[PDB]
Design an enzyme around this catalytic site. Structure first.
Site, PDB file in Angstrom:
ATOM      1  N   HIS A  87      19.954 -39.385 -10.545  1.00  0.00           N
ATOM      2  CA  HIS A  87      20.569 -38.778 -11.704  1.00  0.00           C
ATOM      3  C   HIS A  87      21.329 -39.812 -12.525  1.00  0.00           C
ATOM      4  CE1 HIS A  87      20.488 -34.538  -9.697  1.00  0.00           C
ATOM      5  NE2 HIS A  87      19.372 -34.774 -10.353  1.00  0.00           N
ATOM      6  N   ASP A  89      24.316 -40.008 -13.559  1.00  0.00           N
ATOM      7  CA  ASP A  89      25.628 -40.422 -13.085  1.00  0.00           C
ATOM      8  C   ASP A  89      25.551 -41.486 -12.001  1.00  0.00           C
ATOM      9  OD1 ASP A  89      24.673 -38.085 -11.560  1.00  0.00           O
ATOM     10  OD2 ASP A  89      26.669 -37.890 -10.641  1.00  0.00           O
ATOM     11  N   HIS A 150      22.238 -32.568  -2.170  1.00  0.00           N
ATOM     12  CA  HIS A 150      22.355 -32.472  -3.613  1.00  0.00           C
ATOM     13  C   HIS A 150      21.055 -32.826  -4.306  1.00  0.00           C
ATOM     14  CE1 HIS A 150      23.930 -33.204  -7.616  1.00  0.00           C
ATOM     15  NE2 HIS A 150      23.285 -34.347  -7.545  1.00  0.00           N
ATOM     16  N   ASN A 181      26.313 -29.391  -9.673  1.00  0.00           N
ATOM     17  CA  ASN A 181      25.021 -29.251 -10.318  1.00  0.00           C
ATOM     18  C   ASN A 181      23.949 -29.262  -9.238  1.00  0.00           C
ATOM     19  OD1 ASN A 181      22.705 -29.347 -11.832  1.00  0.00           O
ATOM     20  ND2 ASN A 181      23.683 -30.608 -13.419  1.00  0.00           N
TER      21      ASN A 181
END
Ligand SMILES: C[C@@H](c1cccc2c(-c3ccc(NS(C)(=O)=O)c(C#N)c3)c(C(=O)O)[nH]c12)N1CC(CN2CC(N)C2)OC1=O
Ligand SMILES: [Zn+2]
Ligand SMILES: [Zn+2]
Length: 232
Positions: A87, A89, A150, A181
């Site tokens: 991702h 981030d 995740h 998320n």
């Protein structure tokens, strides 16, 4: 002034460092995503007279600001970076790193997912992490693949010198009332993956989530609890 910095305390574009232990810092930045502002963490580990970076600061300009903040506060060169999942981030800023002489790394799973998603792609593949429970050494850290959580590719990082467990986004902060998320998550496997982390790192003294405040080992159980309840 010494407290762990929080979302409304960091303007987007600015980065702060937080000393976790001798030779271990977290980095904190904030970013906009779908019209909301979020903090996120990464890690910096002293590697002799060099630094190992774990995760970008979530964006190109944030990551440039991270490098500047490291130079201001630490003054040792970042030579390698590991991104702990695909991702933005974690990888957004890899191009900035790559142009600042940093060698960027991620698992092949992360690299494939980043490429497919249109995210920035670390240069070097980290083999030896494809099966849950796998661990490899990387400078002053151990990289551990706990299984899907995740994301399917999420890695955690342990700093053995300091007993610091950087859970990345597979681990939530204690105030989390939601699983964050979960778009790419495996809610069914996540508690099993957290259990693997708990079993593998029973001496962890500091646990750092991907977003939010560090704490102790209880972040692991809390994460499992929240994810199970979210799925429920
Ligand atoms: C880039 C990344 C991403 C963006 C925005 C927020 C978060 C979050 C997240 C959420 C709520 C949070 N707290 S709060 C009180 O509830 O608001 C907190 C906290 N503290 C963190 C996490 C995480 O939990 O790690 N990560 C995020 N993305 C993108 C993504 C899937 N997008 C669809 C496309 N495939 C890309 O999946 C993901 O993780
Ligand atoms: Zn993520
Ligand atoms: Zn995240």
């Amino acid at each position: 002034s010494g407290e762990y910095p929080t979302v409304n305390e960091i303007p987007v574009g600015e980065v702060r460092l937080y000393q976790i232990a001798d030779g271990v810092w977290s980095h904190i930045a904030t970013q906009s995503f779908d019209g909301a502002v979020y903090p996120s963490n990464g890690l910096i580990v002293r590697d002799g007279d060099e630094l190992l970076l774990i995760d970008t600061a979530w964006g190109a300009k944030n990551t440039a600001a991270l490098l500047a903040e490291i130079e201001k506060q630490i003054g040792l060169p970042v030579t390698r970076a590991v991104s702990t999942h695909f991702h933005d981030d974690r990888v957004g800023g890899v191009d900035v790193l790559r142009a600042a002489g940093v060698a960027t790394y991620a698992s092949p799973s992360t690299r494939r997912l980043a490429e497919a998603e249109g995210n920035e792609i670390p240069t070097h593949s980290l083999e030896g992490l494809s099966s849950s429970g796998d661990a490899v050494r990387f400078g002053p850290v151990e990289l551990f693949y706990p299984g899907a959580a995740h994301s399917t590719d999420n890695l955690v990082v342990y700093v053995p010198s300091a007993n610091v467990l950087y859970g990345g986004c597979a681990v939530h902060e204690l105030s989390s009332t939601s699983a964050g998320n979960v778009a790419d998550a495996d809610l069914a496997e996540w508690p099993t993956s957290v259990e693997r982390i708990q079993k593998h790192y029973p001496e962890a003294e500091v646990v750092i989530p991907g977003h939010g405040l560090p704490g102790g080992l209880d972040l692991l159980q809390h994460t499992a609890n929240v994810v199970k309840a979210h799925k429920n």
